[PDB]
Structure formats: C-alpha cells, structure tokens
Short mmCIF file of C-alpha atoms in Angstrom, two decimals:
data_model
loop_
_atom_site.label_atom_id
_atom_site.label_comp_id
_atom_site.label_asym_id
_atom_site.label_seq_id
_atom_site.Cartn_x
_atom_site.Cartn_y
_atom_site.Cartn_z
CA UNK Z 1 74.07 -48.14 -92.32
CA UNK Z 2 74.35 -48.95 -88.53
CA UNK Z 3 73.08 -47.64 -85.27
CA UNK Z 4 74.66 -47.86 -81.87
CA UNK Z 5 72.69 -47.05 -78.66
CA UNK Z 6 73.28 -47.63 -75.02
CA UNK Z 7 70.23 -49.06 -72.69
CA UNK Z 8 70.45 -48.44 -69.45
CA UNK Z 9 68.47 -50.71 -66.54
CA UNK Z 10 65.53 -48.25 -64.83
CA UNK Z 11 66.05 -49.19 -61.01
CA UNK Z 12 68.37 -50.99 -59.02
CA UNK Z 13 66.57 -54.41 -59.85
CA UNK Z 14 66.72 -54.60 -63.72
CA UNK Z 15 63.48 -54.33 -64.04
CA UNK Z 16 63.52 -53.01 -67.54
CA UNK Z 17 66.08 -51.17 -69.64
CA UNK Z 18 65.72 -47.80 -70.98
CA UNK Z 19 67.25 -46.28 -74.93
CA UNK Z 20 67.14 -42.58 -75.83
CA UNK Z 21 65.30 -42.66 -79.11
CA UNK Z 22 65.05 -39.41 -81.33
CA UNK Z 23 61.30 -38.59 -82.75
CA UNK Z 24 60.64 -35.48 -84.93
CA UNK Z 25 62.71 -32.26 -85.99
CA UNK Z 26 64.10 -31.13 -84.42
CA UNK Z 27 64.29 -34.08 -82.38
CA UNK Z 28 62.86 -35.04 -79.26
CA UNK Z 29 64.55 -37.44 -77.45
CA UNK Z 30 62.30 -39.87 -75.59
CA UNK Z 31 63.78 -43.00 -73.77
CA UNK Z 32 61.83 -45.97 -75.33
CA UNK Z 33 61.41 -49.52 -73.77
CA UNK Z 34 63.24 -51.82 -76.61
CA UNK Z 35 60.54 -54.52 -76.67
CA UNK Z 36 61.29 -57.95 -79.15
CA UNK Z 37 58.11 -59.13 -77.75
CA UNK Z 38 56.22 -57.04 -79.13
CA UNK Z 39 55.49 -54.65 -82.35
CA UNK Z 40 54.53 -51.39 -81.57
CA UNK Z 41 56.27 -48.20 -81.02
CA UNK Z 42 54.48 -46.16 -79.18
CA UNK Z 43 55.22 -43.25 -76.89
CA UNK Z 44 53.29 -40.61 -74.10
CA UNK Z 45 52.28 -37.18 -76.42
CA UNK Z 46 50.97 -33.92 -75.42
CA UNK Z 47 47.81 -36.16 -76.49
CA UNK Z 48 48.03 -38.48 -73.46
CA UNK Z 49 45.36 -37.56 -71.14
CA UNK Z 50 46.86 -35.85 -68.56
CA UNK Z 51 45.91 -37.39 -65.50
CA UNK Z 52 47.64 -40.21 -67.05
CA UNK Z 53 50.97 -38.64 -67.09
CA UNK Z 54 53.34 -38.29 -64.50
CA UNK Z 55 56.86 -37.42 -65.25
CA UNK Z 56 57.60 -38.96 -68.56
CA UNK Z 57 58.87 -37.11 -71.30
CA UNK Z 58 55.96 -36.59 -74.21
CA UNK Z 59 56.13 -36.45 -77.71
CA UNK Z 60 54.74 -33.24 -79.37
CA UNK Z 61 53.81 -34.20 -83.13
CA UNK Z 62 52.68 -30.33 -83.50
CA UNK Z 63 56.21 -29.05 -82.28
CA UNK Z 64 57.95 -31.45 -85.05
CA UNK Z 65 58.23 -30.23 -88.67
CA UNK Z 66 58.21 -34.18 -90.23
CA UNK Z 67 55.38 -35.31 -88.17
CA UNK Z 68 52.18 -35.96 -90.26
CA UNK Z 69 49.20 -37.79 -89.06
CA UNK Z 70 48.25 -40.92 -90.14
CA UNK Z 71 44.77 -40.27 -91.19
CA UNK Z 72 42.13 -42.80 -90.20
CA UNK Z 73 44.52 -44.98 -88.44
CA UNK Z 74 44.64 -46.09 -84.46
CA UNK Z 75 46.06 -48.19 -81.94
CA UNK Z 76 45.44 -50.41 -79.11
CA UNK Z 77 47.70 -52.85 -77.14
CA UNK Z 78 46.83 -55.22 -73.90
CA UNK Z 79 49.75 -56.73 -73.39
CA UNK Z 80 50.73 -60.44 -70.86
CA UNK Z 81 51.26 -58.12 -67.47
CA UNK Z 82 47.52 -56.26 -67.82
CA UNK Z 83 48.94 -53.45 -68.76
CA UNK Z 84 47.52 -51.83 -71.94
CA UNK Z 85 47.44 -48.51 -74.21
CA UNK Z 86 45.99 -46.88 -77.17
CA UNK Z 87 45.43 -43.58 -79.12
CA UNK Z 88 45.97 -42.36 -82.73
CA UNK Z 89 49.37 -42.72 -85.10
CA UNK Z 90 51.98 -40.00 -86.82
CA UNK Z 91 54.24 -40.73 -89.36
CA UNK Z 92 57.60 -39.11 -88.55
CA UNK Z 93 61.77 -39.61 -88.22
CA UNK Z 94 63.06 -41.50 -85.80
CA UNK Z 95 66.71 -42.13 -85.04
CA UNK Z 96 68.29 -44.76 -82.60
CA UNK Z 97 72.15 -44.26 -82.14
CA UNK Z 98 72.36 -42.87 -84.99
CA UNK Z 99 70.47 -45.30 -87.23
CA UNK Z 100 67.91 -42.98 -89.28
CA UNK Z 101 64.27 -44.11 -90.40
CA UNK Z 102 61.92 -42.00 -92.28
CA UNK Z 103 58.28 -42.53 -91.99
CA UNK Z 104 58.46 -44.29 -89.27
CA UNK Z 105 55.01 -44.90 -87.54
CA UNK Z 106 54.92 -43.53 -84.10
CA UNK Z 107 51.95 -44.52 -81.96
CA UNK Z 108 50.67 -41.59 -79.92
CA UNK Z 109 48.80 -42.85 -76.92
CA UNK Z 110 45.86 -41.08 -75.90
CA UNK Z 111 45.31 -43.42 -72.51
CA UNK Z 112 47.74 -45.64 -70.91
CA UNK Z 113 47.14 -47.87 -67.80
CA UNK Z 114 48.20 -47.53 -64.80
CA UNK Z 115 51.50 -49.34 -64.66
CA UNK Z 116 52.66 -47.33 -67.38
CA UNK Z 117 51.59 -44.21 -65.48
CA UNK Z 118 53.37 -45.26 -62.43
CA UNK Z 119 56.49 -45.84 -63.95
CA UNK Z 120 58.06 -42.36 -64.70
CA UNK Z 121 61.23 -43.68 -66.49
CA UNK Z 122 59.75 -44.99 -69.27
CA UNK Z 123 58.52 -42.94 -72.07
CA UNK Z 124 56.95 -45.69 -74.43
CA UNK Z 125 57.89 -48.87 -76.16
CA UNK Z 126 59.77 -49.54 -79.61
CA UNK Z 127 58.83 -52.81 -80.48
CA UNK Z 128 60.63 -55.26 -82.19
CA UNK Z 129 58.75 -59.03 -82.30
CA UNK Z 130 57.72 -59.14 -85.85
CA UNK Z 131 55.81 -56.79 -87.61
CA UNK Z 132 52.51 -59.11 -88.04
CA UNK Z 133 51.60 -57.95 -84.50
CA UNK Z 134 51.52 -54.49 -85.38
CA UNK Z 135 48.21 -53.39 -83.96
CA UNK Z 136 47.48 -50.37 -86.28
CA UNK Z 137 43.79 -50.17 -87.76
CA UNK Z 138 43.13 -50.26 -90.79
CA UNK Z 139 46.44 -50.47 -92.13
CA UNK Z 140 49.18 -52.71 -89.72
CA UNK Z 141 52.20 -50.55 -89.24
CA UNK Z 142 56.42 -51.83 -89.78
CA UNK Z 143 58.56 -52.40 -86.87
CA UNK Z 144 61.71 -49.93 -87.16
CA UNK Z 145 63.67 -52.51 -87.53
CA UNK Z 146 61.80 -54.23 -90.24
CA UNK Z 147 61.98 -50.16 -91.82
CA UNK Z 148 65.59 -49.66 -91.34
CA UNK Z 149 66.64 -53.28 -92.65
CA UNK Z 150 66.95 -53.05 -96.32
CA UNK Z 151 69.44 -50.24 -95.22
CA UNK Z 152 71.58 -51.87 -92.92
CA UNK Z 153 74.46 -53.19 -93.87
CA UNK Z 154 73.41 -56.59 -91.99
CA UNK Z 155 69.98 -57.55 -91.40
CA UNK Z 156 70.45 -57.96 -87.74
CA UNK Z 157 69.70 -56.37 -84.03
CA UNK Z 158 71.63 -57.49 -81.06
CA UNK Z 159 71.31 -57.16 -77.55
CA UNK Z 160 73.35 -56.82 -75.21
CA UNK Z 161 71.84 -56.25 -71.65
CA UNK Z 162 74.15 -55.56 -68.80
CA UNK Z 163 73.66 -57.15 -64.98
CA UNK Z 164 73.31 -53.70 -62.49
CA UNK Z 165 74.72 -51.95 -65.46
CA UNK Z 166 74.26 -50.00 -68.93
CA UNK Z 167 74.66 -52.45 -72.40
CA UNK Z 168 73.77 -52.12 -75.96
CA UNK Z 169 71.66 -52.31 -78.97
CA UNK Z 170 73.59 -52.55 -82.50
CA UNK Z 171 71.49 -52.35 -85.56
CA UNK Z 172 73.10 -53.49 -88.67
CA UNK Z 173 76.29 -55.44 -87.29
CA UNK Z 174 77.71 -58.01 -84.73
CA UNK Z 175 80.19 -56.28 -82.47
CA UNK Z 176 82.78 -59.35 -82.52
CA UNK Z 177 84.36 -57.51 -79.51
CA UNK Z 178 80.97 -57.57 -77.34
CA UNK Z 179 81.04 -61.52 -76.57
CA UNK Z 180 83.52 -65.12 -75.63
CA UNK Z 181 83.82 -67.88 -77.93
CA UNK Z 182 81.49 -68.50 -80.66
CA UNK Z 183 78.01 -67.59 -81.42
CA UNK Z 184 75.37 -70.54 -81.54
CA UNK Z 185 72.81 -69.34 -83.73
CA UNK Z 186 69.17 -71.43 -83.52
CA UNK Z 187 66.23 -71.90 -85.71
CA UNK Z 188 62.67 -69.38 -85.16
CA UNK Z 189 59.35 -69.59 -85.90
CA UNK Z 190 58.07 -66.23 -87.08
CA UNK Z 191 53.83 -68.23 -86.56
CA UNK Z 192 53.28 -66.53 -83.46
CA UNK Z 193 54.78 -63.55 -84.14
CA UNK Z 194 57.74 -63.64 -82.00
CA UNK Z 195 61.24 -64.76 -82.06
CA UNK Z 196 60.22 -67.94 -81.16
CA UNK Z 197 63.13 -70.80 -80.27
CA UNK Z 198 63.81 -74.19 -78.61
CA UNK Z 199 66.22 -74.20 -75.76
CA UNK Z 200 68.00 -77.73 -76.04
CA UNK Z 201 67.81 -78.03 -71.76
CA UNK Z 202 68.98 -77.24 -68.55
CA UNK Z 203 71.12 -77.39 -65.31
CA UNK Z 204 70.63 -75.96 -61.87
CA UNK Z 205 73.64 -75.08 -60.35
CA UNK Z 206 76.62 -77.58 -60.58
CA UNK Z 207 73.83 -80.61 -61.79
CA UNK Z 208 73.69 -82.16 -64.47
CA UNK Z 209 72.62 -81.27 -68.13
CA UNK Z 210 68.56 -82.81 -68.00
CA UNK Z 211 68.17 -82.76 -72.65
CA UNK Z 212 64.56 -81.76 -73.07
CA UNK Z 213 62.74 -79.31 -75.54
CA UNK Z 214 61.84 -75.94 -73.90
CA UNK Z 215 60.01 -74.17 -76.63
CA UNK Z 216 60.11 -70.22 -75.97
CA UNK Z 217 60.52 -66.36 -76.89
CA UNK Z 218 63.49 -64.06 -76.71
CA UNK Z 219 61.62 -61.27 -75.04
CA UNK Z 220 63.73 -58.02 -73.45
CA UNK Z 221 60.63 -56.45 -72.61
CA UNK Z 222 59.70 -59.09 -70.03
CA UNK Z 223 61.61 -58.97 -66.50
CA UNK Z 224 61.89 -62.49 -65.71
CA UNK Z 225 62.92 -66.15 -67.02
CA UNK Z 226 59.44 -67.96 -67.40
CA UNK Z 227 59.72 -72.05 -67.70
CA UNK Z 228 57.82 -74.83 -67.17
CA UNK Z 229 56.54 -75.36 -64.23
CA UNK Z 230 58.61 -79.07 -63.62
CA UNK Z 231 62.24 -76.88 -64.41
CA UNK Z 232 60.89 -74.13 -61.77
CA UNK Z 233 60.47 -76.39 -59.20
CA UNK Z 234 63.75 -78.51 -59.77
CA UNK Z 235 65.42 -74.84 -59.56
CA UNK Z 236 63.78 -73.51 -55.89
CA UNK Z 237 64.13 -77.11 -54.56
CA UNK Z 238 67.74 -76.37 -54.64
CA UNK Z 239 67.54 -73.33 -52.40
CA UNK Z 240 66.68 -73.81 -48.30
CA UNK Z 241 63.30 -72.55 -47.69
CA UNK Z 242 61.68 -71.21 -51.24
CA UNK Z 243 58.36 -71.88 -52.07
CA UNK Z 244 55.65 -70.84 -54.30
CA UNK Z 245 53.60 -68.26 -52.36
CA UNK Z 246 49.69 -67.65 -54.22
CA UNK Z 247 49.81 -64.42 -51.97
CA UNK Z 248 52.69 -62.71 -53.48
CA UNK Z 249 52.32 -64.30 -56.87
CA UNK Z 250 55.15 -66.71 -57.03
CA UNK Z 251 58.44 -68.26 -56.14
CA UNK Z 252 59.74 -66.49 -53.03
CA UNK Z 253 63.31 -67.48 -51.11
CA UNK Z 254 64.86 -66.42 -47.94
CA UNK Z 255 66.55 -63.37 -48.69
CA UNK Z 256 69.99 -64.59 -46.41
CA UNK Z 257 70.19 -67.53 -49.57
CA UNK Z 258 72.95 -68.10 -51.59
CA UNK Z 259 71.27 -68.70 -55.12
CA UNK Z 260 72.53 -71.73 -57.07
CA UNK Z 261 73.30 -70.76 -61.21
CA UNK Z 262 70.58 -71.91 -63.69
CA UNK Z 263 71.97 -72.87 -67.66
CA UNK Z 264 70.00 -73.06 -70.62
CA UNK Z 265 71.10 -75.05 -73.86
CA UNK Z 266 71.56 -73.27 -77.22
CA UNK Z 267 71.87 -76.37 -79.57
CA UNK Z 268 74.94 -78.20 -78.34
CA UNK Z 269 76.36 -74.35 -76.44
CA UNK Z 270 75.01 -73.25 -72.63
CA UNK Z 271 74.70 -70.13 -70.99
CA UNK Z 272 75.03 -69.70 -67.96
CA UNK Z 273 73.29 -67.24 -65.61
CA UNK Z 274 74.72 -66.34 -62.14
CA UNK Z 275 72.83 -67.30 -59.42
CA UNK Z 276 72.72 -63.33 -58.57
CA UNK Z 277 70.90 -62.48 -61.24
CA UNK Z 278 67.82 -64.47 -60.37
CA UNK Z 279 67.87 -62.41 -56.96
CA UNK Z 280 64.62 -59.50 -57.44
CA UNK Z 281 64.89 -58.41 -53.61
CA UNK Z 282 63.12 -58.03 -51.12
CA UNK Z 283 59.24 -59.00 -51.78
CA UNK Z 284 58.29 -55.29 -49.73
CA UNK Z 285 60.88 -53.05 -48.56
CA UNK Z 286 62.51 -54.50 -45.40
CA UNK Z 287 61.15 -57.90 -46.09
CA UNK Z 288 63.60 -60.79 -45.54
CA UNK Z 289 61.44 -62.57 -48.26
CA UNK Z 290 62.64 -62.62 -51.54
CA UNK Z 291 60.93 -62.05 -54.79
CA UNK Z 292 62.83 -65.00 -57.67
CA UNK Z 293 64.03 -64.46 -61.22
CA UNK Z 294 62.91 -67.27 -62.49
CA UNK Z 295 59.33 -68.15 -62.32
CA UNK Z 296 56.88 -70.52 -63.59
CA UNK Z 297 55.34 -70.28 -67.13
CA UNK Z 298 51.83 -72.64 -66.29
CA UNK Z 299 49.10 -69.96 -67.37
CA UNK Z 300 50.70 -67.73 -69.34
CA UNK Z 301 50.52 -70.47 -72.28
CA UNK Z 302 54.07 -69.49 -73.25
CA UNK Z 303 57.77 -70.11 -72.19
CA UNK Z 304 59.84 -66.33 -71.79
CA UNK Z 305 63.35 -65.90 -72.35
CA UNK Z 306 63.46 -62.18 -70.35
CA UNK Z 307 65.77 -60.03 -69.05
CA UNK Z 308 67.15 -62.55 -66.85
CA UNK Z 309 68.10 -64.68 -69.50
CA UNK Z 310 68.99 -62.71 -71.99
CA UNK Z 311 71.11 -61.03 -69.63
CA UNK Z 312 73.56 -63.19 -69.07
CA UNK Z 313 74.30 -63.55 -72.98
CA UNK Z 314 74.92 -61.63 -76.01
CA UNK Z 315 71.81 -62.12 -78.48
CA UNK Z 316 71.86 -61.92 -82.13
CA UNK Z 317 68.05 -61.09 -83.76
CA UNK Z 318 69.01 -61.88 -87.49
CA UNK Z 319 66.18 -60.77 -89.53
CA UNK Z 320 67.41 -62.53 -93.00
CA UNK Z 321 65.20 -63.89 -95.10
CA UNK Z 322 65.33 -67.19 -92.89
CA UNK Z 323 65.48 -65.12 -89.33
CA UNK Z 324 67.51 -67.28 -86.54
CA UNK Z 325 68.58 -66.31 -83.51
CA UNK Z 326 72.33 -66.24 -82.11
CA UNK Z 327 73.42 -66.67 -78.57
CA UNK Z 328 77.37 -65.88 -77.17
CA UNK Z 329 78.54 -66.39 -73.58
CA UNK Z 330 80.14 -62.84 -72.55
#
C-alpha cells in the first residue's frame, strides 16, 4: 500500500504545515501537525477542556463506530518550545491520503497549553520520531508509520515541504518525479529516539565549504534551522546590522537586508537554502526588525534540522531494518 497527502504551511511565515488526517467512522477529518520529532499522535476531543479550545476541529471518539478506549492507558507530552499536553487514549482507524491503519492509537487530550490553544489551525500532532518516545502509560503506543509499515510497499516516509506553498507526504514510495539529481542517503542513530544524522558542513552564501561534523535531527515539527552557535554567528556576520538580541530571543536583522544562502553537506551532496527562506518577518507587526531562520542551538543540547532546512530539500525517512535518511536538491 501507499498514501499520498498534501501539507499545507498555516500562515504566511511557514511556521508549521498542516495534513488532513481521517480518525473514526465515519471519518472525521482533523488536520494533524506531521511531527518526525516526535511520537505521539494526539488530537483536541470533545474531551479537551473547553476553555482550552478555540477553533480547532475535535475528535469525538463517542460519534465514531471503531473507536474503543484504551483502558487504563494515558498520555502526557512537554515538548522543547514549553508547550505540553495530556489526557487519555482510543484505539481507532486512521487514514492519511489514503494510507489505512487499524488500531491506531489516538491520544485524546484532556488539557493542552496555551500555545496549542492559541493556534486555531492546528488540530493535534501525528508523530513520527521513533516509536520509543511514545509516551503512553502503561503500555508505549506505535507511531502510524511504524503501524502502517509492514504494509507498505516500501518502508519509507518522505517529505516534501514547500517554501510559501502546499507539498507532500508519501508513505510507502519515493516519488522519482518530486526531486533533481540523485538522492544522498546518510546514516541515523535511532539512541535518542530521533532521526538523528551528521551534516558533513557548511557554506554561507557564495563562501567556501568549512568540513566539520554537525550532529543533528530531521525535525518538520520544529520552525527553524538550529546550529551551533560558531556556524550561527559566521551566518549573521554576513548580513549588515544582525545581532543576537536576549530581548527578543535571538538573531534579529534589518528587515531592508538582502539575506545571503546558507548550505548544509549531505555526505559528499549540499543543499542549498535560499537566503529568503531564512527571512521570519517582522519581529512585531510594523517592525523594521527582523526575526532569522536560522538560530543558535547552545541550550537546547541538540542541533535541529526544521522546516527551514528541510524545506529546501526533498527528505527520504527510510524506516528499513537499518533506517537512513535521504536528501535530494528539488
């Protein structure tokens, strides 16, 4: 089998991408945060307190003739951000462009914080990081993807983000038509849970190629590109007046700038991503300060491949037995 589904940014700054998933029968279609940083699907019910709710679209498990609670068993996720929900689990079908799983366990939030609150677009996450950082008590929960993989007819997720613009997720095969050139495909370590890889280096605009181990995660449900602090600062000292600001909470650049390209090595491949695409406006409407894409890593103890990366490539998750990752130029 295969599945096919578009995702489709939330605002005018990328700041997350949104997939119609279908939960219960008859189904209710929710639109899901596709998350390979995490492991946990889990979605606003008519069980969310309400005050907690404002304009999503909730899952009913009484309104859906599959859904069967998962006796005993709960939830709770803090995630890097702050942010953080919890509540009770369902069994139940869920389909994602047309990809079917049965039994699927679908994480019914009783409270979520307020971020999630305040953003009305998205409905819940469907994680994809590896199953190990499932969060269900007593019994840890599969990944839909680790569910639907047996029945795919490869064991493999891409993504394919666009820039201002709708993209995919294919489940089960690589679209050959969807990238340029060849696919570079890199080693992971599953240890921490994530789809954890080593960039081979970078460049900043036009520079040259600076070799050097970057150890980090493939992570589409994080906004930004998050790097050592030594590569962030080689990147804003090529742009007129940025600086790190400890009031707004990071790099910030004149918003009349003309952002330089950053590239990251994949083995002996690079992608490169426009210098546009590390542009997150204006700091507070009508600012002429600007809020940058790519932002220092020191204190978050990891390295994050987000959005902004990710972006600017096509991105094979190949869940074989051996799971690597594959990165095109498109």
């Amino acid at each position: 089998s295969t599945g096919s589904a578009t995702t489709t940014p939330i605002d005018s700054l990328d700041d997350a991408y949104i997939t119609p998933v279908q939960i219960g029968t008859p189904a209710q279609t929710l639109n899901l945060d596709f998350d390979t940083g995490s492991s946990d699907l889990w979605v606003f019910s008519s069980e969310t307190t309400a005050s907690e709710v404002d304009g999503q679209t909730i899952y009913t498990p009484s309104k859906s003739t599959t859904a069967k609670l998962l006796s005993g068993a709960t939830w709770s996720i803090s995630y890097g951000d702050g942010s953080s929900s919890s509540g009770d689990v369902y069994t139940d079908t869920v389909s994602v462009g047309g990809l079917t799983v049965t039994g699927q366990a679908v994480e019914s939030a009783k409270k979520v914080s307020s971020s999630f609150t305040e953003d009305s677009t998205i409905d819940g996450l469907l994680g994809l990081a590896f199953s190990t950082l499932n969060t269900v008590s007593p019994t840890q929960q599969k990944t839909f993807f680790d569910n639907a993989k047996a029945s795919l007819d490869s064991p493999v997720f891409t993504a394919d983000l666009g820039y201002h613009a709708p993209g995919t997720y294919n489940f089960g095969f690589i679209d050959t038509t969807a990238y340029t050139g060849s696919i570079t495909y890199t080693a992971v370590s599953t240890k921490q849970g994530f789809w954890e890889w080593t960039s081979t280096g970078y460049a900043v605009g036009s520079g040259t190629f600076k070799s050097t181990s970057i150890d980090g995660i493939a992570d589409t449900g994080t906004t930004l590109l998050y790097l050592p602090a030594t590569v962030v600062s080689a990147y804003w000292a090529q742009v007129s007046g940025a600086k790190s600001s400890s009031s707004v909470g990071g790099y910030v650049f004149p918003c009349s700038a003309t952002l330089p390209s950053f590239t990251f090595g994949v083995g002996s491949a690079r992608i490169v991503i426009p210098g546009d695409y590390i542009d997150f406006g204006p700091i507070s409407t009508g600012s002429s300060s600007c809020f940058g894409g790519i932002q220092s890593s020191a204190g978050i103890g990891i390295n994050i491949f987000g959005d902004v990366a990710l972006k600017a490539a096509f991105v094979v998750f190949n869940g074989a037995t051996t799971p690597t990752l594959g990165f095109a130029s498109k």
